[PDB]
Amino acid sequence: DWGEVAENLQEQTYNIYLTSNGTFRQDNEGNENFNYWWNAHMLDVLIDGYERTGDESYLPKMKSLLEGIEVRNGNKYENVFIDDMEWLGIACLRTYKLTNDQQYKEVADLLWEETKQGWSDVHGGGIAWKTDTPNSKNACSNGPAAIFALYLYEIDQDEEDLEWAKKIYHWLKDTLVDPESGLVWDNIDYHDGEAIINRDWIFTYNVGTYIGAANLLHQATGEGMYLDDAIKSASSVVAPGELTTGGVLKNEGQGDGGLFKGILVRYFTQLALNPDLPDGKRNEFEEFVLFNAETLYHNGLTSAGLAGPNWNDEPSGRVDLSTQLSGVMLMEAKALLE
């Protein structure tokens, strides 16, 4: 069953990438480089496993990871990459909602304060990409920020957190979202004195976090406009276009790009579980997840359980942790859809 596929990928990922301090190394060829936001998504994958199985063995692995991230980041959680902080904050609030472990909440609160400090009037709003790159406002430092704020609002029910979610999402939609397709451009930045939007870089995980934010805003407010937003973006993901090759989410390389597919699948799946989704869209989205899962399972996984950047070809060399996490995420999402 899909659950057993996901469990096997979980075990393989853990054993191949485990390294010092309960964190996870950059690749399977001995590169020990610490990648903060990849390890945040490893936390996300471990939570996926815990939620599926209820197996208590996930909990020490999660906790060690949380603490190891702090150590390998220089004995602090703050990072000059603001998107990094947002991703870890999301994982921490997910875990808090599931375990009530206050250590995760305290980390998330620190990171939320860091995140808000990244907002500025450059380009009319939005959270900066990095604390030393204030003039770049990126989909990956805003979509996740809106999700982070929505999890915080769901938990502490402080209205200022929903205010923040709405502010962030409104700026994102106005600036970086194509009004017709709902695809999401990577960033707006100043280059040689002038403001440029990179429309060439349409990445899976940016439309993914836009969908995720839209879906959570729908759940936080009830307003159908958010669900319509989510549906338009997701429908453009399913239909043939820039993000698919033969009905399969495209190869976006390794390194950071290796993780992009998995993040889209995560939030795509959360949309498909939205109770107010029309039945036809639900069936279509579930089918899309199944088709990608089948394709990776039969054509992309090496015998040892490693997924490559192209879910249709087995990798023959280095596999970065990010790439592998995307495969694990797809399988956990399929299992979640039963």
Residue numbers in the entry: 54 to 391
What text comes from the article?
We solved the crystal structures of ShGH76WT (apo-form), ShGH76Asn (with Man3) and ShGH76Ala (with Man4) at 2.0 Å, 1.47 Å and 1.9 Å resolution, respectively. The ShGH76WT protein formed crystals belonging to the I 121 space group (Hermann-Mauguin notation) with three chains in an asymmetric unit (ASU), whereas the mutant protein ShGH76Ala crystallized in the P22121 space group with one chain in an ASU, and the mutant ShGH76Asn crystallized in the P1211 space group with one chain in an ASU. Besides negatively charged amino acids, the ShGH76 active site features seven aromatic amino acids (Trp90, Phe134, Trp140, Trp182, Phe256, Tyr258, Phe313). Superimposition of bound Man5 from BcGH76 suggests that Man5 does not fit the cavity of ShGH76WT due to a steric clash of the Trp254 of ShGH76WT.
The marine bacterium Salegentibacter sp. Hel_I_6 (Bacteroidota) isolated from seawater off Helgoland island (North Sea) contains an α-mannan inducible gene cluster with a GH76 family endo-α-1,6-mannanase (ShGH76).
